[PDB]
Amino acid sequence: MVVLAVLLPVVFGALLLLGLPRALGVLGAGLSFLLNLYLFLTHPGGVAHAFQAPLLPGAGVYWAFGLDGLSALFFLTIALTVFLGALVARVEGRFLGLALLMEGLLLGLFAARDLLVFYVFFEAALIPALLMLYLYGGEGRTRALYTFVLFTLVGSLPMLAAVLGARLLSGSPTFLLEDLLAHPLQEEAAFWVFLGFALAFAIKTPLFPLHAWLPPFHQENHPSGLADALGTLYKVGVFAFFRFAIPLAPEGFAQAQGLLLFLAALSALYGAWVAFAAKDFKTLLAYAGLSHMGVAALGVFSGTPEGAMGGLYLLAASGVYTGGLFLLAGRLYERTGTLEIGRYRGLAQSAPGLAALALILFLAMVGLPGLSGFPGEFLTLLGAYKASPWLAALAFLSVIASAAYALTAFQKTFWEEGGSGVKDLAGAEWGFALLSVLALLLMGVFPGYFARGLHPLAEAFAKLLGG
Amino acid sequence: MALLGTILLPLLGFALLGLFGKRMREPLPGVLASGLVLASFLLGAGLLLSGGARFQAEWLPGIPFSLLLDNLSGFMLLIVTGVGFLIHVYAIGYMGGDPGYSRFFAYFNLFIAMMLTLVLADSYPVMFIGWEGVGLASFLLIGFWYKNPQYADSARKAFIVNRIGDLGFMLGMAILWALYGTLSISELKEAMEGPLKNPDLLALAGLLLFLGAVGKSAQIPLMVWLPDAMAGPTPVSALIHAATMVTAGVYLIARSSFLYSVLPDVSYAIAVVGLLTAAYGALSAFGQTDIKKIVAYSTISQLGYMFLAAGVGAYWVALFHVFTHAFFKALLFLASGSVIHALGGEQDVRKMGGLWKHLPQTRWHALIGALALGGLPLLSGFWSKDAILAATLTYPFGGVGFYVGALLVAVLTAMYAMRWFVLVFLGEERGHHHPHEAPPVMLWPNHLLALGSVLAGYLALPHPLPNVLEPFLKPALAEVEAHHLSLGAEWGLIALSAAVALLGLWAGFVFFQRKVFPAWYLAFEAASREAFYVDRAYNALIVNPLKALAEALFYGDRGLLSGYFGLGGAARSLGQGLARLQTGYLRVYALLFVLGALLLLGVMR
C-alpha cells in the first residue's frame, strides 16, 4: 500500500548514511522506483490505498495518506529521478543516503491527505538538502545555505497561521483535507489564508521577484548534482497551489489571478531570456527551471482545466529531465573536473553517445513535441490563453529564448573541434541514459496515458473556481 | 495502422543507423535508409490507390492522434517519399569515405518519417509534431560534419528563427481551441462551414499559422535562415529546398484552404509577401559568387511564386508549382552537388568556369534544370509559372499589380539561372580536376530527376489540353473556389510568358558572360552577393540587443539578490541596535526596566 512506497527511499538513505555501503542505496532508489511505478500501475482511483492513523487526536492531526491521480506518477517521477541520482551519481559521499532520504521525504509530501501532515513534510525536506549542500561541498556553501534555507523558512512559518486559520476559522474538526474542503472559508478570511498559502507557495515555485535563491543553491552542492537533482524535485510549489491553496480559499485567488498569471508569464520569459546569458550549467539549469515553472504556474492560474493539466504535467516530467541534466552534468564533471560552458569544446567526436543523451534531454527541455515538455507547455498555452491571452503570449516568448539558450549550450559544449578527448560512458551513466530516454520518450509520445489521473482533478478544481 | 507504417519504417531505420549504423558497412546505412524509404512510398501508394486511409489514436484529451490520407495528403506523400528516396540513393553515392555514414542515413530516415508525420495529420497538434520534428532533423543534418564552427551556428539560427514561427503556430493553435475546441483539421473544417463567429480572432489564428508558415517556407522577414542551410551535405540541401520543408509552408495553407478561402485580407497579404519574396530572392540571386547560395535564392524566389499562387485563391496552382519545382530544384541542387564532388568541394564561381566539354552528362543535367527554373516554354517550371501568372489575373484578390510584377520576376528568374549556368560552365578555366567525376549512383537518379523536370510539365495544361491535376487536388481537400476564366486572350498570355521568358534567358546568357559588368551593376553584384544587407540590420535592433538584454536582465537579477542581502543586514543592524540597547551599566538596566513596565501598564487600559 501507499505508506510503504512513501517510506522505502527514506529507510535506504539511513542505511546509506551510517550504513554500508554506497552501492546498496542505488538499488534502494531502484526499488523505490519499481514500487512507485507499481502503485502507478493498478491504481483504482482518487482513494487508492487510503490511510488514517491518530497523530495528535486531541489536536486533530492524523496521519492521512493515499495516491491521487496526481500523487500517482509523482511517486514514479521522483523515484525515477532520484534513482538516476543514486546510480549514475558519483557524489557517493555516503550522502547518496541524504538523497534517498530526500526522495522519500518528497514522496511523503505528495501523499499527504491532511493539511498539517503535509505542512510537516513540507518543512522537513529542508534538512538533507541543506546538509548535502553544506558538508558535501561548495566554497560559498554557508551563505548559499542561509539563502536557500532562510528564504524557505521565512516563507514557511507564517503559513502555519493559515493552516491553523484554515482549520480554526473554518471550524474544521481536523486537519484532514476532505474535512477542510468540506468547510469553505468566507470573504476576507479565505483572503488572508490564501495569501498566507500563496507566499510560501510562490517562493518555492519560484515566481519572478522571489527566485533569487535558486541559482546559489544549485551551484554549491556536490558537483555531480545529486543534491541538485533532488533540489529540483523540491520545486513543488505548483502542486501545493493546485491541491491546497486554490481549493481551500478560491475566493482570494479570483482576485489574485491576474497578478499570478502575469508573474507566471514574466517568470517564463525572463527566466528563458536571462538563462541565455548564463555561463555555467548550474545557473543555466536554474533559470531554465524558472521558465518551466513559469509555464506550469501559468497553466494552473488560468482556471481552465486545459492549462492546469498542462501545468501539473509539465511539473512532473520536468522534475525528471531537469534532474537528469543535473546528474549528467555532474558525470561530465567527474571525468573533466569543470562545469564551465566555454572551455573544453570538442566532446562530440570524443564522446560517442553522450551527444545523443544530452541532446534528447535538452529537446525534452525546450518543449519539443514527442518529448515530455510539449504536452504540458501546450495545454498550458491553451488555458493561459483562455484566461488571459496576453500573459500567455508574453509567457510564450519563451520557446524562442528556450531554444536559444539550450542550443547555444549544446553546440558550444559538444559539436566543435577536438580537445584531448573524453571518457566515453560509465556503466551507471548507461542505465541513467537509457532509463532517462525511455522516460522522456514515453511521457512525450503518450501524454495521454500519464496525466489521465490529472484530467479529473484538472477540470473539477477548475469548476471549483466556477459557480 | 498500415498508414502509420509509412512513418514507422524510416524511424525504425533511423533508429538502426543512429543507434548502430556505424556497425554497418559503408554502403549499408544508405542501403537500409533508401530501402525503408523505398517501401514507404510504395506501401503508402498502395493505400492511396486503394482510395484513402485513416488513423485515429490516443493522445492529449480532446486532441486525438489523427492521420488522414487523402488526395491532398497523397500528392505530397508521393513527392516527398519519391524524390526523398532518389536523394537517399544519391546520398549513398555522395556520402563516401565520410565517417558517420550511420549518422547521416539515420538522420535521413528520421527526416522522412517526420515529414510523413506532418503531411498525414487530421489534427493540428499532430501537424505540429510534424513541424517541430522536421525543423529538428534539419538542424541535425545541416551540422553533420561538426568539426567546423561555421556549419554549427547555421543550424542554431535555423531552429531559432524557425521557432519564432513555431511559436506563431502554437499561438494560432491555442486560438482555435478556445474558439472551437476540436483541433482536428477534418472536424475543424466541418465546424468552420456556415456563419463562423468572431472573425477578427479567426483571422489572427490564420495569421499566426502563417507567421509559422513564413518560417517554414522561408519567406520574409524570416527569410534569412535558409541561405545558410548550404552548410550541410548537398543532398540535405536537395531534400530541404525541394522535396521537403518549405513545401509544408504551402501545404499548411493548402489543407487550410478552407480557412484562407474565407479570408480576403490575409490572402491579399499572403500574395503580397509571396511577390516580395520572389522579387527579393531573384534580385539578390545572381550577385552571389557561390554556387550553392545562388541556387538557394531561386528556392526563395520560387517559393515566393507559390505563395503568390496560394495567395489569390489558386491552391491547386500553388501545388502545381510545388510539384514542378520539386522536380527542377532537386535537379539543380543534385547537379551542383555533383559538380563539387568533382572539384573536391571547391564550391566557387569566380574560381570556376569552362566545364562544358570536360564534363559529360552533367552539362545536360544542369542545363535542363536551369532552363526549367528559367521556365523554358515546354518544361514544368513554365507551366507552373504561368499557371500562377494566369491565376493572378483570373482568381479573386485581383492580380493586376501582381501580374506584371511576377512577370518581371520571371524575367529575373530566367536571368540569374543563366548567370549561374554561364559562370559555372563557360568562360575559360581556373583550378583543377582529374579523372572520374560522376559515379553511377549519383547521376543515375539525377537523370530521372531531369526526366521528371521536363515532364512534370503537362500534368496540368491550360484547359483544352487536359488539366489532370486540378480534379485530383480539388475535391478531397482544397475545397472552396470562386474563379472566372477566359480565352483567346489567355493564349496571348501564355505566349507572353513564353516570349518574355525566352528573351530573358538569352539576355542573361550574354550579360553574365559579359566581363564589363559595367558601372552600377557591379555594386548591384556586391549588394546581391551581400543579400541587400538584411542580416546586418537584424543584428542592429533585433539580435544583439536581445542578446544584450539577456545580460541586462541577468545583472538586474544579481542586483536583486544583493538587495535581499541588504534586508539580511538591516535585520542584523536593527538587532545590534537592540543589542546596543544594553550598555552594561546597572542604572541603565534599571531605567530601561521601569520604562518597560510603565509601557505595559499603559497598554492595559
| CA distance linking residue B394 with residue A184, whole number of Å | 67
Q: After which residues is chain A broken (C to N over 2.5 A)?
A: none
Residues β-bridged to residue A54: A62
Identify whether the C-beta of residue B403 lies closer than 8 Å to the C-beta of residue B389. yes
Q: Which residues contact B429 (CB under 8 A, 6 or more apart)?
A: B353, B354
Domain boundary among B500, B529, B558: B529
Q: How many helices (H) and strands (E) does chain A have?
A: 22, 2
Q: Calculate the dihedral angle through the C-alpha atoms of B146, B147, B153, B155, rounding to the nearest 10 degrees.
A: -20
Identify whether the C-beta of residue B274 lies closer than 8 Å to the C-beta of residue B305. yes
Query: Identity (one letter) of the amino acid at A431?
Result: G
CA-wise closest residue to A96 among A19, A7, A35, A31? A19
Identify whether the C-beta of residue B409 lies closer than 8 Å to the C-beta of residue B279. yes
Domain boundary among B481, B509, B529: B529
| CA distance linking residue A322 with residue A299, whole number of Å | 19
| CA distance linking residue A97 with residue A103, whole number of Å | 10
Query: Identity (one letter) of the amino acid at B4?
Result: L
CA A13 to chain centre: 20
Interchain proximity B178–A385, CB inside 8 Å: yes
Residues B549 and B495 in one domain: no
CATH label of the domain that carries residue B576: 1.20.5.2700
Measuring CA to CA, how many Å separate A313 from each of A275, A400, B97, B257, B260? 22, 21, 46, 34, 34
CA-wise closest residue to A33 among A4, A9, A68? A9
Interface of A with B in 316-345 (CB under 8 A): none
CA A27 to chain centre: 22
Q: HSE of A111 in the Cβ direction (CA atoms, 13 Å)? A: 29
Task: Give DSSP secondary structure letters for B164-192.
Answer: HHHHHHHHHHHHHHHSSS--BHHHHHHTT
Identify whether the C-beta of residue B262 lies closer than 8 Å to the C-beta of residue B301. no
Residues B127 and B201 in one domain: yes
A164 CB burial (10 A radius; 0-12, 13-18, 19+): middle
Residues B124 and B177 in one domain: yes
Contacts of A39-44 with CB under 8 Å at 24 or more apart are: A39/A2, A39/A5, A39/A67, A39/A75, A40/A72, A40/A73, A40/A75, A40/A76, A43/A67, A43/A69, A43/A72, A43/A453
Query: Identity (one letter) of the amino acid at B535?
Result: D
- CA end-to-end distance (rounded Å), chain B: 84
How far is B175 from chain A, CA to nearest CA, in Å?
8
| CA distance linking residue B298 with residue B508, whole number of Å | 15
How far is A370 from chain B, CA to nearest CA, in Å?
7
Residues B216 and B330 in one domain: yes
Residues B113 and B216 in one domain: yes
B396 CB burial (10 A radius; 0-12, 13-18, 19+): middle
Provide the resolution (angstroms): 3.3
Identify whether the C-beta of residue B527 lies closer than 8 Å to the C-beta of residue B430. no
Enumerate the residues of chain B whose CB falls inside 8 A of the CB of residue A276: 547, 550
Is the preceding peptide bond at A247 cis, omega within 30 degrees of 0? no
Strands B53-57 and A51-54: unpaired
DSSP-H helix ranges across B288-399: 291-311, 315-342, 362-374, 380-394
| CA distance linking residue A244 with residue A301, whole number of Å | 13
Interchain proximity B550–A276, CB inside 8 Å: yes
Angle at B558 between CA B550 and CA A342, to 5 degrees: 55
Structure-block grid coordinates of residue A266:
514574466
Angle at B480 between CA B479 and CA B486, to 5 degrees: 120
Which helix (H) or strand (E) element contains residue B66?
A: strand B65-69
Structure-block grid coordinates of residue A131:
546538509
CA B287 to chain centre: 23
Interface of B with A (CB under 8 A): 18, 58-62, 125, 128-129, 132-133, 136, 139, 143, 146-147, 149, 152-153, 156, 159-160, 163-164, 166-167, 170-171, 173-175, 177-178, 546-547, 549-551, 553-554, 557, 560-561, 564, 568
CB atoms closer than 10 angstroms to residue B583: 10
CA gyration radius, chain A: 21
Structure-block grid coordinates of residue A178:
476532505
List the single residue in B with minimal CA-CA distance to A417.
Answer: B147
CA-wise closest residue to B115 among B246, B236, B13, B245? B245
Q: Which residues contact B394 (CB under 8 A, 6 or more apart)?
A: B314, B483, B484, B485, B486
A426 CB burial (10 A radius; 0-12, 13-18, 19+): middle
B187 CB burial (10 A radius; 0-12, 13-18, 19+): middle
> Does A416 reach chain B within 8 Å, measured CB to CB?
yes
Residues B338 and B197 in one domain: yes
CB atoms closer than 10 angstroms to residue B188: 20
CA A458 to chain centre: 18
Residues B441 and B574 in one domain: no
| CA distance linking residue B391 with residue B312, whole number of Å | 7
How far is B352 from chain A, CA to nearest CA, in Å?
30
- CA end-to-end distance (rounded Å), chain A: 37
SS3 B585: coil
Q: HSE of B323 in the Cβ direction (CA atoms, 13 Å)? A: 30
SS3 A54: strand
> Does A276 reach chain B within 8 Å, measured CB to CB?
yes
Residues B478 and B605 in one domain: no
Query: Identity (one letter) of the amino acid at A368?
Result: L
Number of domains in chain B: 2
Interchain proximity A407–B136, CB inside 8 Å: no
CA-wise closest residue to B546 among A270, A169, A230, A309? A270
Identify whether the C-beta of residue A380 lies closer than 8 Å to the C-beta of residue A396. no
Residues B103 and B229 in one domain: yes
Strands B53-57 and B65-69: antiparallel
B552 CB burial (10 A radius; 0-12, 13-18, 19+): middle
Enumerate the residues of chain B whose CB falls inside 8 A of the CB of residue A452: 61
| CA distance linking residue B451 with residue B448, whole number of Å | 5
Domain extent, residue B155, equals 1-529
CA-wise closest residue to B383 among B365, B410, B361, B423? B410
Q: Which residues contact A423 (CB under 8 A, 6 or more apart)?
A: A335
Identify whether the C-beta of residue A283 lies closer than 8 Å to the C-beta of residue A340. no
| CA distance linking residue B520 with residue A462, whole number of Å | 67
Measuring CA to CA, how many Å separate B577 from each of A417, B177, B570? 60, 60, 10
Interchain proximity B174–A381, CB inside 8 Å: yes
| CA distance linking residue B183 with residue B179, whole number of Å | 10
Residues B522 and B557 in one domain: no
Interchain proximity B160–A403, CB inside 8 Å: yes
Backbone angles phi, psi at B551, to 5 degrees: -65, -50
Residue indicated by cell numbers 520557446: A399
Q: After which residues is chain B broken (C to N over 2.5 A)?
A: none
Which residue, among B22, B123, B177, would best test binding to A if mutated, counting the most A CBs under 10 Å from its CB?
B177
CA-wise closest residue to B388 among B308, B478, B466? B308
A208: which DSSP letter?
Answer: G
| CA distance linking residue B221 with residue B202, whole number of Å | 22
Q: Which residues contact A134 (CB under 8 A, 6 or more apart)?
A: A141, A142, A145
Residues in chain B: 605
| CA distance linking residue A298 with residue A315, whole number of Å | 12
How far is B130 from chain A, CA to nearest CA, in Å?
9
Query: Identity (one letter) of the amino acid at B436?
Result: H
Task: Give DSSP secondary structure letters for A129-192.
Answer: HHHHHHTT--SSHHHHHHHHHHHHHHHHHHHHHHHHHHHHTTT-SSSBHHHHHHS---TTTHHH
Domain boundary among B514, B529, B544: B529
DSSP-H helix ranges across B184-245: 185-190, 199-217, 234-238
Q: HSE of B316 in the Cβ direction (CA atoms, 13 Å)? A: 21
> Does A396 reach chain B within 8 Å, measured CB to CB?
yes
| CA distance linking residue B448 with residue B412, whole number of Å | 27
Measuring CA to CA, how many Å separate B193 from each of A19, B85, B189, B190, B196? 70, 38, 7, 6, 7
Measuring CA to CA, how many Å separate B426 from each of A191, B423, B514? 82, 6, 11
Query: Identity (one letter) of the amino acid at B586?
Result: L
SS3 A53: strand
CA A132 to chain centre: 18
SS3 A87: helix
Interface of A with B in 144-203 (CB under 8 A): 147, 150
Task: Give DSSP secondary structure letters for B127-158.
Answer: HHHHHHHHHHHHHHHHTSSTT-SHHHHHHHHH
List the single residue in A with minimal CA-CA distance to B135.
Answer: A368
Structure-block grid coordinates of residue A45:
482511483
Residues B435 and B540 in one domain: no
Secondary structure of A456-467 in HEC code, one letter for each residue: HHHHHHHHCCCC
Identify whether the C-beta of residue B146 lies closer than 8 Å to the C-beta of residue A412. no
Interchain proximity A370–B166, CB inside 8 Å: no
Interchain proximity A274–B553, CB inside 8 Å: yes
Structure-block grid coordinates of residue A83:
534513482
Residues B504 and B557 in one domain: no
Identify whether the C-beta of residue A192 lies closer than 8 Å to the C-beta of residue A79. no
Q: Calculate the dihedral angle through the C-alpha atoms of B489, B493, B494, B495, rounding to the nearest 10 degrees.
A: 90
Q: Which residues contact B102 (CB under 8 A, 6 or more apart)?
A: B17, B18, B20, B21, B22, B23, B24, B29
Residues β-bridged to residue B54: B68
